[PDB]
């Protein structure tokens, strides 16, 4: 084993991570990444094996030294002048506009420094670089539409009931992934909005349309619909006896388990909920961890890969037969560990998103009197364990 | 424009860094052409260079193929070289110029810079001031013996100039075996003037490359 | 009328020429009241603080415009990167030649990107203006490229859009392929040769020595590429005649620094003369400046179309690119720099010299090729297709016939079995009959090469909603001549307005009709007499899951009761009810007319009823946009006005003992 005693006379020993956009959340929301940092150096520290071969994750506040929301010039210049100090080995971005999100790009490509981009809202991805990842950890439909292809497939129904209320959602990655399966079958979809101002005629139209799908596809499906049309249906449901052998109503869209609907719900339905939330502290967790699975699998590789530093000045790049930035963006995409708040998994370090934990709770007809959610499967990822 | 000018300091120290400046400023350096320098001594022959690109692909030969390392300065639209350990038949009459990629010929007049071997002290020994005398005596043709008699400075292969741009009817470069010693007795000669007689005063003044002297006599 | 220019430059020599162009550019405006700023930055290594020392001599003269004024950009990978991010939160345009990369012209994550460089995307543009002539639609997309490719890709994909037509192979690849030679086997196959690399120069020289060691270097290929493409080290394999298109405006600092500055100085005037010249805030560092008038000053800038004596239309592409840049296509032929075309703005028409190729001629080449790749599939059709098993390994002795006369026969390499049974286990069997006679006869008629392969399922396929990303097509061979497995299908499908929907006929050459095979309720009297038209659950006879009879069956309106009777008993082949009916297992077997006729005449115990419904030509099923589609048929009924397809079929499927 090479012994790496060569090239921590700078760092020392320490893998130094930059605290760039220090600036609280104030744009479209009052989140805090102080806090979030606090408590994910106090979360590493507490389960020790995290960092091993002696390493520790150098937290180094780079602050400029609202009006700095979005310049980059601060958070770039004065922050690149006081991490060259000792070494760029590691850097943790937290976007807050297009502004601190652009030079991201710029930074991964005159240092070679694998960066994460925890952005708000979904952003194009028009830079396919591995160097600048992209990680936004936000309600995403892939999962739900995975869940609702694995409920079909282990149950033989090829039809559904697709509820398109708005068009203001990520229905693409639905669409994209329809395209693929052979499994969907649509012949009607359920609109609630569609010019009906007043209210005779949207429950005539309502009236119409569940007798229509009574016979052509009895399984509506949750996939994109408010919560307000959620309630309706739940309402007009118990006052026309929509049973599930009749309507079988599936809640595919699980946001949150405190969000999700637990009155009126009909013995038999198909109501699944995330149990993670969307917490920044419990995100800034998850990158600090998949991190740590980073440079340990670079440390498992070459002893002097993760202890290298990419870069030492703000104008230096790795462009060597051995770099480490290509490894290190590189190794973390095959390793896929299961994160706090979700499964990390990286997609091909781009298009990043984690899969958060599910579980089936069908909500059937309970025998002692009190609606509980019985957990009739499991899915720990694609797989689900019957019982 | 068209600029083939070779700028490179053609006098350094033996077994030194050779920092060769080719100041090419013409359409563009963005990996366009070859740039590199034509090992033409006389006595062997030369091999099958290399070329620079964008990435500045320092490597020329197998043997200096990474020992050297050509410094892509893209301020001033040129690049440096790092030249070391350089033998006697390497060190010869280079042509760091606009190479077509392809290696075609030539459609232009005899340029270049041709660094030598010698010490920068032995070369560097004080311009000697010689007055220029005319002869007007020897009155045999249409070519005689009259000129400057400068010598004592920077090798031969620099920017040989005349009395403020004077008559240059029959000017032609023509590399020669170099002097150890470092006293090159350089000295230009036209063939129709300078051979009449009178007065007429035909003083030249060789410039010099790392220097720009022109007011020795 | 204070708009001041910013410019971006490196060398003293690209700030006297910058001044040049701006006391020059008094004949351009007309001499107007606006002052062009001398800003005169020195170039820096490090990309940020370069950026950083532009932003701050702009921001001590508040200048309104970008422009770079140097092909070397400061960032380490050649992109303009950092007067992007750095103009994109001031909603600046960047109006300065940086790069001739195309993915940083596409505006997806950036808004404030104008670079009036001319990418790929442009040059794929000039590419299809001049391709309207050519009718070279079908291009093979081997770029190896993850952002330029990408670029390319969506490019084309958009020109095929705006065509009204469709490619033949578009994908992307990765850089760094080494068996590249698998690619050009892959497009030597399709009848597309348009060959388009525009990745780097690496991948440019090694397909061009991959192509020079087959000798498929002009021979018909079409070979468009750029200055970029043939730069460094790419030529020093290809012979004299690639199409090297040259970047005009893309690396000159002469008279492009001057263009650019006049263009500039002309975009502004015409942007001060219309309305939207408020003046944004002061954009200092470490404050938010953030122009809220940032997509009404783009949209005014964007429509600033000039009437200039060189370029007769300027105006931006969809992504932000030159104002119609005129790209002077040259070739290498002698290793020169000939024009063979300008881009004017609406075509490219050429001057003096033409299209030149290395391998082909001077003139329109061959872009598309010929039909001589036609893969016969057969079938189970032992009545017609003879399919004998091998003799020997590869030895197929040819067998005698009733006139004495050793019967050419073709061998036929296929999995013998079904899907279960042999999923890819080719077997060659020596496969005789009319079907070989037929096929020699075309080859001797035409020049095409057939090539006689066996399928590997047993069944024809049907219309239904296939378990394949729900595709409403054929599952079977109709299917695979879809996918481009298949030709030619040589067996006699049933005509019909559903299978006339995805592909097409040719001429019919068995002209038979269906009946019922009976055993002679002992008779059948054909299949309207109710005591088989409502058949019970004991009372079913053979039928073949996706077969003519399915299709016939499926297409009824009044046998939809017996349709789903069927299901019961259905086969995956013929054989197996042929099987059964002759060895008293089931009532009846609904087949063709000539098979059954055949099995009748051999068969003595099975004897086939006389009515006979359903007359109709089955016709040879073709592709859809075959070249040769008409040719074929005008072969076969050529073939049957004569005395010669009457003979063999009395010959060969007439056995009567």
């Known amino acids: 084993h090479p012994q790496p005693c060569q090239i921590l006379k700078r760092i020392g020993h320490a893998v130094r991570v930059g605290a760039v956009h220090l600036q609280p959340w104030t744009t479209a929301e009052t989140l805090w990444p102080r806090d979030a940092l606090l408590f994910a150096v106090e979360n590493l520290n507490r389960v020790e094996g995290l960092l091993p071969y002696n390493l520790s994750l150098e937290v180094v506040m780079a602050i400029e030294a609202s009006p700095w929301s979005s310049d980059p010039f601060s958070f770039l210049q004065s922050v690149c002048h006081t991490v060259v100090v000792q070494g760029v080995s590691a850097l943790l971005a937290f976007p807050q506009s297009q502004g601190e999100m652009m030079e991201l790009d710029l930074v991964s490509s005159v240092l070679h420094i694998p960066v994460l981009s925890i952005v708000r809202h979904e952003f194009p991805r028009e830079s396919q670089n591995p160097l600048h990842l992209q990680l936004s950890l936000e309600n995403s439909l892939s999962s739900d539409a995975d869940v609702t292809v694995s409920i079909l497939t282990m149950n033989n129904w090829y039809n559904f009931s697709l509820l398109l209320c708005q068009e203001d959602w990520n229905i693409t990655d639905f669409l994209l992934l329809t395209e693929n399966n052979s499994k969907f079958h649509l012949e009607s979809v359920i609109n609630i909005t569609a010019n009906l101002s007043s209210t005779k005629d949207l429950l005539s139209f309502l009236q119409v349309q569940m007798d229509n799908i009574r016979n052509s596809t009895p399984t509506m499906v949750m996939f994109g619909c408010d919560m307000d049309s959620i309630r309706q249906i739940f309402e007009m449901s118990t006052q026309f006896g929509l049973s599930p052998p009749e309507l079988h109503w599936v809640l595919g869209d699980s946001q949150n388990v405190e969000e999700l609907r637990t009155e009126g719900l009909p013995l038999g339905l198909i109501a699944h909920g995330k149990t993670t939330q969307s917490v920044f502290e419990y995100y800034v967790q998850d990158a600090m961890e998949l991190v740590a699975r980073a440079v340990a699998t670079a440390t498992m590789i070459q002893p002097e890969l993760a202890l290298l530093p990419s870069t030492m000045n703000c104008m230096d790049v790795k462009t060597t037969n051995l770099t480490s930035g290509q490894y290190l963006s590189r190794f973390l995409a095959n390793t896929t560990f299961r994160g706090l708040s979700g499964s990390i998994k990286v997609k091909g370090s781009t298009i990043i998103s984690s899969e958060n934990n599910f579980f089936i709770w069908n909500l059937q007809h309970d025998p002692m009197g009190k609606p509980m959610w019985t957990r009739l499967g499991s899915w720990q990822g694609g797989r689900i364990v019957m019982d | 424009d068209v600029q083939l000018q070779e700028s490179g300091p053609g006098l350094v120290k033996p077994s030194q860094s050779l920092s060769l400046t080719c100041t090419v400023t013409?359409?563009?350096?963005?990996?366009?052409?070859?740039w590199n320098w034509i090992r033409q001594f006389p006595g062997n022959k030369l091999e099958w260079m290399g070329y620079?690109?964008?990435?500045?692909?320092?490597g020329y030969n197998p043997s200096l193929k990474s020992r050297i390392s050509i410094t892509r300065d893209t301020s001033k639209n040129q690049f440096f070289l790092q030249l070391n350990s350089v033998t006697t038949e390497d060190t010869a009459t280079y042509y760091c110029?606009?190479?077509?990629?392809?290696?075609?010929?030539?459609?232009?007049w005899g340029q270049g810079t041709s660094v030598t071997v010698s010490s920068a002290k032995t070369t560097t020994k004080g311009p000697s001031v010689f007055p220029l005398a005319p002869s007007s005596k020897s009155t045999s043709g249409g070519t005689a013996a009259l000129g400057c008699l400068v010598k004592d400075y920077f090798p031969e292969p620099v920017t040989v100039s005349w009395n403020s741009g004077a008559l240059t009817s029959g000017v032609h470069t023509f590399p020669a075996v170099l002097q150890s010693s470092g006293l090159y007795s350089l000295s230009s000669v036209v063939t129709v003037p300078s051979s009449s007689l009178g007065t007429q005063t035909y003083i030249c003044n060789v410039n010099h490359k790392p220097s720009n002297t022109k007011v020795d006599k | 009328k204070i708009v001041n220019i910013g410019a971006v430059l490196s060398t003293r020599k690209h700030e006297q020429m910058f001044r040049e162009a701006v006391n020059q550019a008094n004949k351009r405006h007309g001499s107007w009241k606006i002052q062009l700023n001398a800003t005169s930055v020195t170039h820096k290594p490090n990309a940020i603080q370069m950026a950083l020392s532009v932003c701050e001599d702009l921001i001590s003269s508040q200048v309104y415009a970008i422009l770079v004024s140097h092909p070397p950009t400061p960032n380490d990978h050649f992109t303009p990167t950092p007067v992007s991010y750095t103009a994109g939160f001031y909603r600046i345009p960047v109006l300065g030649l940086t790069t001739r990369m195309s993915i940083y012209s596409d505006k997806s994550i950036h808004l404030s990107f104008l670079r009036t460089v001319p990418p790929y995307s442009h040059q794929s543009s000039v590419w299809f203006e001049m391709m309207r002539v050519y009718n070279w639609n079908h291009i093979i997309l081997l770029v190896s490229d993850d952002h330029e490719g990408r670029a390319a890709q969506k490019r084309l994909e958009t020109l095929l859009e705006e065509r009204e037509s469709k490619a033949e192979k578009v994908l992307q690849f990765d850089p760094g392929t080494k068996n590249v030679t698998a690619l050009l086997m892959e497009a030597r196959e399709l009848e597309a040769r348009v060959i388009i690399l525009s990745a780097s120069e690496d991948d440019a020289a090694t397909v061009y020595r991959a192509a020079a060691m087959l000798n498929m270097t002009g021979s018909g290929y079409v070979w468009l590429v750029g200055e970029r493409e043939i730069s460094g080290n790419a030529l020093r394999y290809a012979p004299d005649g690639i199409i090297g298109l040259q970047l005009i405006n893309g690396k000159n600092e002469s008279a492009h620094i001057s263009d650019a500055v006049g263009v500039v100085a002309q975009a502004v005037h015409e942007l001060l003369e219309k309305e939207n010249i408020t003046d944004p805030p002061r954009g200092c560092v470490g404050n938010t400046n953030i122009w809220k008038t940032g997509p009404l000053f783009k949209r005014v800038l964007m429509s600033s179309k000039y009437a200039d004596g060189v370029t007769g239309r300027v105006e931006f592409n969809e992504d932000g690119d030159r104002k119609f840049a005129n790209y002077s296509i040259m070739n290498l032929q002698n290793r020169k720099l000939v024009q063979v075309g300008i881009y004017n703005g609406t075509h490219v028409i050429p001057n003096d010299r033409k299209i030149i190729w290395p391998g082909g001629e001077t003139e329109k080449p061959r872009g598309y090729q010929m039909s001589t790749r036609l893969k016969i599939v057969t079938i189970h059709q032992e009545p017609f297709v003879y399919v004998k098993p091998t003799m020997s390994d590869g030895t197929c002795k040819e067998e005698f016939t009733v006139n004495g006369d050793p019967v050419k026969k073709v061998i036929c390499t296929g999995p013998n079995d079904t899907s279960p049974g042999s999923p890819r286990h080719t077997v060659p069997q020596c496969c005789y009959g009319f079907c070989i006679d037929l096929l020699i006869k075309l080859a001797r008629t035409m020049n095409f090469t057939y090539e006689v392969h066996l399928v590997a399922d047993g069944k024809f396929g049907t219309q239904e909603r296939v378990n394949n990303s729900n595709k409403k097509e054929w599952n079977g061979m109709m299917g695979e001549l879809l996918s481009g497995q298949a030709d030619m299908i040589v067996a006699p499908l049933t005509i019909n307005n559903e299978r006339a929907q995805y592909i097409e006929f040719s001429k019919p050459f068995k002209y038979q009709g269906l009946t019922i095979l009976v055993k002679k309720e002992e008779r059948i009297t054909g299949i309207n007499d109710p005591r088989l038209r409502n058949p019970s659950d004991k009372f079913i006879y053979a039928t073949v899951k996706q077969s003519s009879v399915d299709i016939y069956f499926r297409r009824q309106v009044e046998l939809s009761t017996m349709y789903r009777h069927m299901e019961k008993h259905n086969y995956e082949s013929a054989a197996e009810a042929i099987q059964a009916v002759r060895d008293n297992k089931l009532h009846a077997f609904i087949w063709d007319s000539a098979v059954l006729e055949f099995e009748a005449s051999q068969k003595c115990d099975l004897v086939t009823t006389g009515e006979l419904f359903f007359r109709s030509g089955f016709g040879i099923g073709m592709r859809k946009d075959s070249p040769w589609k008409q040719n074929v048929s005008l072969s076969i009924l050529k073939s049957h006005e004569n005395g010669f397809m009457e003979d063999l079929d009395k010959t060969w499927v007439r056995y009567q003992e």
């Open positions: 620079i690109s964008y990435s500045g692909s320092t």
């Open positions: 013409g359409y563009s350096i963005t990996s366009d052409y070859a």
């Open positions: 110029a606009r190479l077509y990629y392809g290696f075609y010929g030539m459609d232009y």
